Amino acid sequence: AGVAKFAKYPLTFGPSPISNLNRLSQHLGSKVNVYAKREDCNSGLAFGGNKLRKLEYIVPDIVEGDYTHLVSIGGRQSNQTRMVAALAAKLGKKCVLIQEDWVPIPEAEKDVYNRVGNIELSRIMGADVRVIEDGFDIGMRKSFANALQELEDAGHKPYPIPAGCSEHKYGGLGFVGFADEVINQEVELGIKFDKIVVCCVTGSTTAGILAGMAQYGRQDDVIAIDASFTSEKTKEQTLRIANNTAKLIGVEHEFKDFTLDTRFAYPCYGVPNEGTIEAIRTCAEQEGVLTDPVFEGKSMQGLIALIKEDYFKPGANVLYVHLGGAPALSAYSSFFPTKTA
Amino acid sequence: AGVAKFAKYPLTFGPSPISNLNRLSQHLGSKVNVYAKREDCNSGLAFGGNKLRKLEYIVPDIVEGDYTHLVSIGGRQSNQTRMVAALAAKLGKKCVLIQEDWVPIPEAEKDVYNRVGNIELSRIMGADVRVIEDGFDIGMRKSFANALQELEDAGHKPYPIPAGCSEHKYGGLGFVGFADEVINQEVELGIKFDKIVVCCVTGSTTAGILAGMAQYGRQDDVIAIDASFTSEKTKEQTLRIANNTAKLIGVEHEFKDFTLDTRFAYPCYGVPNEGTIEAIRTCAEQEGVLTDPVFEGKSMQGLIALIKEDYFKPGANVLYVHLGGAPALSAYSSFFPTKTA
């Protein structure tokens, strides 16, 4: 073990807080005690989020080396790119973002969906936002590739940052430190967490938590709720990252598999189902915490489902990992009508 | 030290952090060292913000007695209403929000202003929203009273929460504590702040800082920035709340006036000017910090304007106060076209 041997650049206030959602717990039958590690309350940089934790280990590279532009990629309401933008700004460097068509832009939303939410913030931060129309994929893209070359031939030095940082060499380190941090907060809080629920789409967050938790032999505490709907390639890339990050930090353990619940990614990436919406409501109504229809909502419904079906031992302390993404809620305004009194 | 005498209910994560906007400082000629107390990253309750700090000293009364409904009031894209709804969610009480029309909805944002941003969030938290046509006015409102009586007649027990908690009995205690934090934080920073810049509209925020900073005889360090474009009723309500609060905390010093720069409320409350957009973007492009069109962008352009006219001592440490309100930015996307490189 040793994430400590890796250069880190501060992009957050420090250990993200842990909220005690004791009210949402009772509402769900008091079967478990739900807690939430607020990564959505990461830093001052454009609403923060899980991405900032990842970026903290990639930045040093960008700074030591000589670069000029930071180019990343993601969907329309990509939280990722919005943070690379904020990052680029804070680092005083140019930024090129490739917004692809990863989600079937719902009808009563194709008006705002492309200019009201996360993408808007990237522009406001002065990023070179580029709207392209390609499919959804958690791997390396050709568009991302050409964009890179474009800048190079232009005489610049582009810094590549794959979707969600996941496939990046150090894309898994940020959440390794997330485990160290959780272990420490368990002691200060006087609360041991039996399980950790986290949304998974491109990997790294879960992989990092897996490799990190492994340092204490607790990898199995993890429960990733798929939100990509492409479970197959998702579990393969997550596991691929987990083993690399483990090798990096010195963890000998070999990840052959992990808990990846797939019952909630439907209909598909970026589109919430009746369940997602119900979960966002329930959580918002009970704790005043906001979750989005693309990720947190689904991981939340998932959390709610498992609790329902008495998946956890009676009284178990479950740590829900709120990764953020609430700023993209304005591109889904149509999914939440007003409640009757 | 008369603020510790009042009961306080935890709604935030603790003492708000201070960011060192050193890059924005270099950009602006290195005239002064700008910092920013992040009230926008103070809670896990729907993005947080200043209202929450105020609400902390008001919640005790809500739980002490027996109230069923929490009713507040504000513009369509009000932050106050959004947070009150989150509080209602948390306290397990019911909510009813009055969204008056205080802003001349830009012709370009007409199909968004009442469905996106803050208003969307309130609805998700199950807040009983009510879009009324009453105009702008920080003072008490008719629609407000009508709602209290209505509910009260329905056989309920409402709890009055004025616009921004400003005209509430304890509405000023909130930021009195803010002052305390500032003095303490100066210590932990090894530096002293020469000035404090803060947006100002309904009152209690600056009022609380004044009453508070006064405990240290530094009320003059405060530099409010109007955003209402109705300085008279604002300066008078502020000054009023300021003296009302000062009495509760013990501070004898009576406030007869204060520094309220009114050069940027133009053209009016809710609508930004080219300077606001310039500011919002400058800050966004320099630090990755997002400020809104309605409040923070103006107090931010004011801060920028003041630094140009060399208003501060060379190398002065000015503490900008970020009160949040970035969630309504989605209702002003029209004002931010993609930049050119």
Helices A274-287 and B117-124: angle between axes, nearest 10 degrees: 90
Contacts of B218 (CB under 8 A, 6+ apart): none
In a domain, B60, yes or no: no
How many domains in chain B? Answer: 2
Which chain A residue's Cα is nearest to B283? A125
Phi-psi region of A153 (alpha: psi -120 to 50; beta: other; left: phi over 0): alpha
User: What technique was this entry resolved by?
Assistant: X-ray
No. of helices (H) and no. of strands (E), chain A: 11, 10
Taking only residues 91 to 110 of chain B, the set having a beta carbon closer than 8 angstroms to any beta carbon of chain A reads 92
Listed residue (A175, A159, A130) closest to A64, CA to CA: A159
Residue A293 identity = P
Q: What are phi and psi of B306, to 5 degrees?
A: -60, -35
In a domain, B136, yes or no: yes
Rounded to whole angstroms, what are the CA distances from A189 to A17, A20, A178? 11, 11, 16
* A-interface mutation test, from B28, B116, B330, B332, most A Cβ less than 10 A away: B330
User: How many contacts (CB atoms, under 8 Å) link A and B?
Assistant: 151
Identify all chain B residues contacting A287, using CB atoms and an 8 Å cutoff: 89-90
Q: How many CA atoms lie within 13 A of B74 on its CB side?
A: 29
Asked if residue B295 and residue B220 are part of one domain, the reply reads yes
Identify all chain B residues contacting A17, using CB atoms and an 8 Å cutoff: 13, 44
Identify all chain A residues contacting B128, using CB atoms and an 8 Å cutoff: 338-339, 341
Q: What 3-state class would DSSP assign to A214? A: helix
| Alpha helical stretches, state H, chain B | 22-27, 50-56, 59-64, 79-91, 117-124, 142-154, 173-189, 204-214, 231-248, 274-287, 296-308
Asked if residue A177 and residue A139 are part of one domain, the reply reads no
* Active-site hit among A25, A72, A78, A228: A78
Cβ atoms B92, A23 nearer than 8 A: yes
Domain boundary among B167, B187, B219: B167
Taking only residues 124 to 153 of chain B, the set having a beta carbon closer than 8 angstroms to any beta carbon of chain A reads 124-129
Asked if residue B187 and residue B144 are part of one domain, the reply reads no
Whether chain B has a CB inside 8 Å of the CB on A200: the answer is no
CB atoms within 10 A of CB A6: 15
Tokens for A296, please give them.
Answer: 């947190």
Reported as type and span, the H/E element at residue B97 is strand B94-100
**B73 DSSP assignment:** E
Cβ atoms B327, B82 nearer than 8 A: yes
In a domain, B58, yes or no: no
Yes or no, beta carbons of B117 and A284 under 8 Å apart? no
| Alpha helical stretches, state H, chain A | 22-27, 50-55, 59-64, 79-91, 118-124, 142-153, 176-189, 205-214, 231-249, 274-287, 296-308
Tokens for A173, please give them.
Answer: 């380190």
Cβ atoms B246, B254 nearer than 8 A: yes
Is the backbone peptide bond immediately before B158 cis, with ω within 30 degrees of 0? no
In a domain, B59, yes or no: no
Identify all chain A residues contacting B333, using CB atoms and an 8 Å cutoff: 112, 115-116, 120
Asked if residue B288 and residue B161 are part of one domain, the reply reads no
In a domain, A26, yes or no: yes
In a domain, A57, yes or no: no
Whether chain B has a CB inside 8 Å of the CB on A242: the answer is no
Asked if residue A267 and residue A124 are part of one domain, the reply reads no
Which chain B residue's Cα is nearest to A112? B112
Whether chain B has a CB inside 8 Å of the CB on A216: the answer is no
Listed residue (B23, B43, B52, B27) closest to B35, CA to CA: B23
What is d(CA B326, CA A327) in angstroms, rounded to the nearest whole number? 9
Which chain B residue's Cα is nearest to A325? B47
Domain boundary among B121, B142, B167: B167
Taking only residues 284 to 303 of chain B, the set having a beta carbon closer than 8 angstroms to any beta carbon of chain A reads 284-290
Yes or no, beta carbons of A41 and B44 under 8 Å apart? yes
- In the block, tokens 């705002």 appear at A112
Yes or no, beta carbons of A286 and B89 under 8 Å apart? yes
Listed residue (B5, B57, B3, B25) closest to B181, CA to CA: B3
- In the block, tokens 């009576």 appear at B254
Of residues B13, B112, B285, nearest to A17 (C-beta): B13
Whether chain B has a CB inside 8 Å of the CB on A259: the answer is no
Tokens for A294, please give them.
Answer: 């693309």
Of residues A127, A285, A288, nearest to B87 (C-beta): A288
Contacts of A341 (CB under 8 A, 6+ apart): B128
Q: Which residue range(s) make up the domain with B88?
A: 66-167
Asked if residue B182 and residue B241 are part of one domain, the reply reads yes
Taking only residues 152 to 191 of chain B, the set having a beta carbon closer than 8 angstroms to any beta carbon of chain A reads none
In a domain, B261, yes or no: yes
Output the domain CATH number for residue B302: 3.40.50.1100
Asked if residue B319 and residue B272 are part of one domain, the reply reads yes
Q: Is A16 marked active-site? A: no
Taking only residues 11 to 30 of chain A, the set having a beta carbon closer than 8 angstroms to any beta carbon of chain B reads 13, 17, 19, 23
Identify all chain A residues contacting B85, using CB atoms and an 8 Å cutoff: 288
Yes or no, beta carbons of B124 and A336 under 8 Å apart? yes
> Where does residue A107 rank: exposed (0-12), middle (13-18), buried (19+ CB within 10 A)?
exposed
What is d(CA A212, CA A321) in angstroms, rounded to the nearest whole number? 15
Of residues B126, B128, B288, nearest to A46 (C-beta): B288
What is d(CA A313, CA A29) in angstroms, rounded to the nearest whole number? 13
CA torsion A255→A261→A267→A271, rounded to 10°?
Answer: -80
Whether chain A has a CB inside 8 Å of the CB on B216: the answer is no
Listed residue (B58, B7, B3) closest to B250, CA to CA: B3
Contacts of A197 (CB under 8 A, 6+ apart): A223, A224, A225, A299, A302, A303, A306, A318, A319, A320, A321
What is d(CA B319, CA A333) in angstroms, rounded to the nearest whole number? 36
Q: What are phi and psi of A18, to 5 degrees?
A: -120, 120
Asked if residue B266 and residue B174 are part of one domain, the reply reads yes
Q: What angle do CA B164, B34, A129 make, to 5 degrees?
A: 80
Cβ atoms B280, B274 nearer than 8 A: no
Residue B112 identity = V
* A-interface mutation test, from B77, B124, B156, most A Cβ less than 10 A away: B124
Asked if residue B223 and residue B155 are part of one domain, the reply reads no
Listed residue (B263, B254, B206) closest to B231, CA to CA: B263
Domain boundary among B167, B193, B214: B167
Asked if residue A78 and residue A25 are part of one domain, the reply reads no
Which chain B residue's Cα is nearest to A116? B330
Asked if residue B90 and residue B12 are part of one domain, the reply reads no
Asked if residue B197 and residue B115 are part of one domain, the reply reads no
Listed residue (B196, B209, B212, B291) closest to B4, CA to CA: B212
Q: What are phi and psi of A255, to 5 degrees?
A: -85, 110
DSSP, residue by residue, A75-106: -TT-HHHHHHHHHHHHHT-EEEEEE---S---
Of residues A17, A128, A330, nearest to B330 (C-beta): A330
Identify all chain A residues contacting B41, using CB atoms and an 8 Å cutoff: 13, 41, 43-44, 48
* Active-site hit among B16, B43, B72, B78: B78
In a domain, B55, yes or no: no
